[PDB]
Write a protein that binds this DNA or RNA. Structure first.
Ligand SMILES: [Zn+2]
Length: 362
DNA sequence: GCCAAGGGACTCATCAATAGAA
RNA sequence: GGUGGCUGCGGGAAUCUCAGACACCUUAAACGCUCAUGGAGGCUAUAUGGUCUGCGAAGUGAGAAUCACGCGACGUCGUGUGAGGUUCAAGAGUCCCUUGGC
DNA sequence: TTCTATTGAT
């Protein structure tokens, strides 16, 4: 019943806290690079990889050294977790060395990039959560907007810089999540359509989860923005402004899609005991990920149809397969075996529901 | 050699000691 | 007078308040804006068609777009601090890889 | 000066 859960809140640090955040990110990156180089040199020297303990000790001697004493300014937890990041990169590489086929590459030097994070643990109430405030080590109280009810025991806080002037902190808390009570409906079947994002059916009726309002309208504004950027010559300030506006429109599209999927998946979890989706505008990967983790948290069970199931071809009533349904132009078709005409999307959702129950076994 | 966006695999600290301060 | 929406802030989405503007006349559709410069093109639908434009299109440079309070400068501007309604929803981190663009 | 916040070693 106790789950690792993350609460993302937007940070609004003042000038000094922003300076300290940037210093901490730089220090973490420098430590990662330096001790990657040190491990490589050690393997070249003695043929034995340095343990995390040996890398930790040299960091402590690095901190006291005059040439690298500046690391004392930033939080210790950030540097040590950067060292743990290096160790995990090495661990991934070592695990994949034996395996054939897909192989994790050797760790590479960390480079300056817009999205960087530093992670600080919790100990002796150094992290405290108030109403509209958040306390982080070495920083003090920082004002947070959109702070939900944060419960459980705080484990660590990940301070992330999405882009310049945009900071988000992901507070990891070990919160107990109570199971949702019995759902009004038993099971659902979910599809993919062109005009409609999905066709959710409980068996009594079909509910068309159409695309969110203004989604097609926003896609129009996406096309307009690209035209202006394309004709604009590169390197101009107005070209930069057009690129920023295009980036903002992309961000709005992503946010609207995520909100639509979050509300839809929460509704599916609350409304149906068992949810069944075929595994494959779509954004299907995030939909499946959210459905699976929310079902695990709230006690629902997700049954994913085997991709070998050709639901669209089969008729729900009789199971006859028709090659005509393979053609997309055939939105409405009649099954000669069952002598019935049914909508393609409606027939697909009912079949996906039927297979979802079979896989769960009920 | 340089940036952005997706995807798959694995995972999500604790405590004794100690310096300092309102 | 009534109706709709483009752009900006209000954690995300819708609504709404306000603001930059504006369209039309009971139908809701379309479009962010200002200044300077620029010198015939710009947008949409199905190679074809429609609309804007030369008392100025694309492109380039600059700027403003909620509220309260303090400070400085010349009623005005610059700066910092603080605040922003109602309803629904919010699981992230690390590593490598892939793709796209330079 | 006892409570608060940070550090090094696992
Ligand atoms: Zn049939």
């Amino acid at each position: 019943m106790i789950r690792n859960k993350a609460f993302v809140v937007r940070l609004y640090p003042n000038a000094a806290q922003t300076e300290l955040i940037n210093r901490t990110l730089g220090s973490a990156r420098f430590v990662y690079n330096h001790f990657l180089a040190r491990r490589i040199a050690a393997y070249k020297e003695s043929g034995k990889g340095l343990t995390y303990g040996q890398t930790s000790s040299e960091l402590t001697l690095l901190k006291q050294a005059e040439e690298t004493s500046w690391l004392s300014e930033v939080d210790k937890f950030a540097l040590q977790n950067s060292l743990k990041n290096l160790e995990t990169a090495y661990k991934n590489f070592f695990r994949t060395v034996k395996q054939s086929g897909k192989k994790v590459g050797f760790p590479r030097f960390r480079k300056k990039r817009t999205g960087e994070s530093y992670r600080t643990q919790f100990t002796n109430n150094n992290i405290q959560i108030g109403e509209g405030r958040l306390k982080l080590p070495k920083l003090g109280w920082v004002k947070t907007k959109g702070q939900q009810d944060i419960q459980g025991k705080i484990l660590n806080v990940t301070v992330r810089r999405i882009h310049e002037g945009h900071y988000e902190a992901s507070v990891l808390c070990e919160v107990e999540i109570p199971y949702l009570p019995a759902a009004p409906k038993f099971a659902a079947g979910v599809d993919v359509g062109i005009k409609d994002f999905a066709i959710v059916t409980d068996g009594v009726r079909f509910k068309h989860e159409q695309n969110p309002k203004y989604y097609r309208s926003t896609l129009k504004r996406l096309r307009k923005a690209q035209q202006t950027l394309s004709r604009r010559k590169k390197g101009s300030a107005r070209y930069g402004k057009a690129k920023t506006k295009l980036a903002r429109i992309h961000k709005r599209i992503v946010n609207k899609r995520q909100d639509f999927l979050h509300k839809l998946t929460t509704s599916l979890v609350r409304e149906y005991e068992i949810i069944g989706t075929e595994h494959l505008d779509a954004g299907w990967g995030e939909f499946i990920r959210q459905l699976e983790y929310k079902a695990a948290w709230y006690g629902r069970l997700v049954s994913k149809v085997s991709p070998y199931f050709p639901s669209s071809q089969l008729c729900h009533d009789c199971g006859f397969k028709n090659p005509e349904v393979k053609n997309l132009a055939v939105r409405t078709w009649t099954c000669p075996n069952c002598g019935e005409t049914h909508d393609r999307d409606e027939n697909a959702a009912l079949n996906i529901r039927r297979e979802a129950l079979v896989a769960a076994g009920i």
